[PDB]
Amino acid sequence: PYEESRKFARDAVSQAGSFFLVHVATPLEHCEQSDKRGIYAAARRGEIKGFTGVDDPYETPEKADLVVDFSKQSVRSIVHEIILVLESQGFLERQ
Amino acid sequence: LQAASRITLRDFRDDRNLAILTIDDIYRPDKTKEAKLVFGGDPEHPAIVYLNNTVKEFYIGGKIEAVNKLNHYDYVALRYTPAELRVHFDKLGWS
Amino acid sequence: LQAASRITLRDFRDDRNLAILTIDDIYRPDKTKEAKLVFGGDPEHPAIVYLNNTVKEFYIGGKIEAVNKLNHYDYVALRYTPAELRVHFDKLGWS
């Protein structure tokens, strides 16, 4: 949820190789409506304290290497966008 | 042959019946206007010299009905219809 | 659940809804007979151990309506449906 954290991970990992941040920007409403475990429900009614999106914030990424929406795109299409970035940076030069 | 006429469109390579064109008209094209604005003009241009020498005096308009695919015996694996290619791009997540 | 009930068949890998089954009946199969006639009767036969320890108490029967094809992300090009294989054999004139 926090920019400070993601920035930390990016710096930690960069010391040894490349780091890609993919923001699965699926909208909250979509996430809640599709929740099939009742966690958003419980968090809404106080059964869980400071749940992200409900009682705790989600600092939206600003310079994400790739932004995706699970509401608007299928997974194979999203996976493929990710594969395309990797391919385009020479990481996947296959066998 | 006059409007409302149902013709069979034949394939010269094997005399296969390909399409049935139901006429809408049988007008005679201004091969001069066409060749000037549509193909730029110049009496040399390949299409023009085809237009004047090979194209018949009149065109036969009319929507079409598909009766047979049209037999190619080479590189079937490389022959794609817009449907086929759309399905392929879809299976691969290609956007 | 009951005769006439319409249920959704979900994928456990990704909670995707694959089809709506419309219940014909809800019956208690005799597993001992099933295990005997179909699989041989031997208590150590895999299918039987599975029938005895994993299969539930009742069987739900019913015609299926398809909503989505299961999602697989591996070797899509090797995954053929019977229609696809049939179109393939046909194009290459395989008989």
Curated annotation (Swiss-Prot), chain A:
Disulfide bonds: none annotated. It comes from the Eukaryota. It is found in: Cytoplasm. 3'-phosphoadenylyl sulfate binds at residue 37. Homohexamer. Dimer of trimers. The adenylyl-sulfate kinase (APS kinase) is non-functional. It is involved in allosteric regulation by PAPS. PAPS binding induces a large rotational rearrangement of domains lowering the substrate affinity of the enzyme. Catalyzes the first intracellular reaction of sulfate assimilation, forming adenosine-5'-phosphosulfate (APS) from inorganic sulfate and ATP. Plays an important role in sulfate activation as a component of the biosynthesis pathway of sulfur-containing amino acids. In the N-terminal section; belongs to the sulfate adenylyltransferase family. In the C-terminal section; belongs to the APS kinase family. This is Sulfate adenylyltransferase. It comes from Penicillium chrysogenum (Penicillium notatum). The gene is met3.
Curated annotation (Swiss-Prot), chains B, C:
Coiled coil: none annotated. It is found in: Cytoplasm. Catalyzes the first intracellular reaction of sulfate assimilation, forming adenosine-5'-phosphosulfate (APS) from inorganic sulfate and ATP. Plays an important role in sulfate activation as a component of the biosynthesis pathway of sulfur-containing amino acids. Homohexamer. Dimer of trimers. In the N-terminal section; belongs to the sulfate adenylyltransferase family. The adenylyl-sulfate kinase (APS kinase) is non-functional. It is involved in allosteric regulation by PAPS. PAPS binding induces a large rotational rearrangement of domains lowering the substrate affinity of the enzyme. This is Sulfate adenylyltransferase. It comes from Penicillium chrysogenum (Penicillium notatum). The gene is met3.
